[PDB]
A paper describes a structure:
In this context, we recently reported the characterization of a novel xyloglucan utilization locus (XyGUL) that confers Bacteroides ovatus, and species harbouring syntenic XyGULs, with the ability to utilize this abundant vegetable polysaccharide across sampled human populations. Here, we present the three-dimensional structures of BoGH31, BoGH43A, BoGH43B and BoGH3B, expanding our knowledge of the structural determinants required for xyloglucan degradation. Our analyses highlight key adaptations in these enzymes that confer their specificity for xyloglucan oligosaccharides, while also providing a rationale for the maintenance of two divergent genes coding for GH3 enzymes, and similarly two divergent genes for GH43 family members, within the same PUL. While we were unable to determine a structure for BoGH3A, our structural and sequence analysis of BoGH3B has also allowed us to highlight further potential differences between these two enzymes encoded by the operon. Together with existing biochemical data, our analyses of the three-dimensional structures, and various enzyme-inhibitor complexes, of BoGH31, BoGH43A, BoGH43B and BoGH3B provide molecular-level insight into the stepwise breakdown of xyloglucan by the BoXyGUL.
There are two GH43 family members represented in the B. ovatus xyloglucan PUL: BoGH43A and BoGH43B. Both enzymes have demonstrable activity on l-Araf-α-PNP, though BoGH43A was considerably more active, and both are thought to be responsible for the removal of pendant arabinofuranoside side chains from solanaceous xyloglucan substrates, thereby converting S to X for further processing by the α-xylosidase and other members of the PUL. Crystals of BoGH43A in complex with AraDNJ and AraLOG were obtained by soaking native crystals in 10 mM (final) solutions of respective compounds supplemented with mother liquor for 60 min, prior to cryocooling. Soaking of native BoGH43A with two putative inhibitors, AraDNJ and AraLOG, yielded respective enzyme–ligand complexes, confirming this as the active site. AraDNJ was able to displace TRIS from the −1 sub-site and appeared bound in a low-energy 3E conformation typical of iminosugar ‘furanose’ inhibitors. The side-chain carboxylate of Asp140 (O3 and O4 positions), the backbone amino group of Ala94 (O4) and the OD2 atom of Asp34 all directly coordinated the inhibitor. GH43 members typically contain three highly conserved acidic residues in their active sites to impart activity. Together with Asp34 as the general base, which activates water to attack the anomeric carbon, Glu189 is ideally poised as the general acid, while Asp140 completes the triplet of residues and is important for modulating the pKa and orienting the general acid for catalysis. AraDNJ binds to BoGH43A with Kd = 35 ± 4 µM, while AraLOG binding was too weak to be measured using this technique, consistent with its inability to displace TRIS during crystal soaking.
Numbering used by the authors: 20 to 521
The structure:
Amino acid sequence: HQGYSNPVIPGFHPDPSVCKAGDDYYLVNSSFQYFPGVPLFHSKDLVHWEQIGNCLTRPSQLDLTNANSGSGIFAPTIRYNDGVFYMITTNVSGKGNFLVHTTDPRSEWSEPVWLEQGGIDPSLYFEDGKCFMVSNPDGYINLCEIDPMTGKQLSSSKRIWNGTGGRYAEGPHIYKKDGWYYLLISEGGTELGHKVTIARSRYIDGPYQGNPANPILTHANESGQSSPIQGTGHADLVEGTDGSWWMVCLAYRIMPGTHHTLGRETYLAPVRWDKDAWPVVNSNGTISLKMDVPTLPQQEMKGRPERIDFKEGKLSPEWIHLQNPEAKNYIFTKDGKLRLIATPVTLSDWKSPTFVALRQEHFDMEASAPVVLQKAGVNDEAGISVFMEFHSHYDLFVRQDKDRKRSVGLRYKLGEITHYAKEVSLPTDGEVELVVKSDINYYYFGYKVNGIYHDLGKMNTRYLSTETAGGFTGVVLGLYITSASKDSKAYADFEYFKYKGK
Ligand SMILES: OC[C@@H]1NC[C@H](O)[C@H]1O
């Protein structure tokens, strides 16, 4: 009933959108180049969320050909109307705006319904048995009516608002309250200028008048300059079960030199919204890591195990691949291990490697996995990658050398630099566990064999940040295998993956 910590969904979880279905809440984030796409969460209190799935789970729903951290799936919106859930988003590397739908969030969602109106950040609003679509073609928020089952546009597109004048007017959502249509948007860009603004009109098609108190949420001003949270925006308003009001939004946690490696994460703010008043977010349009505020009655949910095993023969919804995966290269062994089949595709090829990953969700964490490389030719490797983009990743691996010898290697890829930090000979026998630790300043790398941990050294976090590397994503920690020999049939078994955040 009182108190929570932000972010409510840590790590790479941007552009949150939320809907209420009775006493259940469902939330979606953008996923860019990763498959499956559009993680789907469930909560009873808005504070604790369980990843129950992903909306885009089949290749036919999600073409990721040549997708990267600056493309693929952009902001999604989720809405619930008359027993049907709708997830509407843009595939920027593919065919653009579309939705998928289902009567059961945990099931396989529909095939894509492709939509006519352009721009990005498509969103839906329902009234009087009609479905209204907004999006932002040419930097104008445009409104139309659609049949959401067929994708047919039923009225012409009308321009309605283009914000208060801030850059990149986007993330439009319509709500109706107290006889007003409210249009909530983001301005200022998704970096340090991010801000939430709002306007209203008696008519859905305008004219919209901006809140004299805009912006309603931002850390861009003097009031936010000292905050460890920055870039607050891309919000979605939602009603509490007790009649209170809330917004979910994106933001990020800054690091020395103005860097962020954990991506844009999902945050929660209380909203005062009296009858016939404009909404006010958390008194002064800011948020904090510790939120000492009343809440809906709190119910804890299932989270990431500290030791994930592969005995059930299914990866959880949290695991993600690069672009569309070669599904045959991920298999489960008789004795319940994850088996990755090698291909020659490296982590710098801008194509899908045999690679499967979990989002890093804490500044301070330790991740590890045992690695059993088998049937390997010389230079074949398997291990863990701290991965931001195809040109920006740190690789820790067991490599097959000549004469049945092996070694542990540590390779940093940063644009034109491919830097071998360490190459250390392994003992002929002994199961190797690879270990990656971090704090806000460094990644630390090591390996454990025969009960002894060896330090391989450290590398700066900043070179993998969004500010350095570009794109719209966060660091993921990936298990991978790459072959680099004649006709290799190499594979590697991973018995578990350990992750613990401080
Ligand atoms: O986070 C990806 C895009 N950034 C701005 C826009 O609102 C989003 O779709």
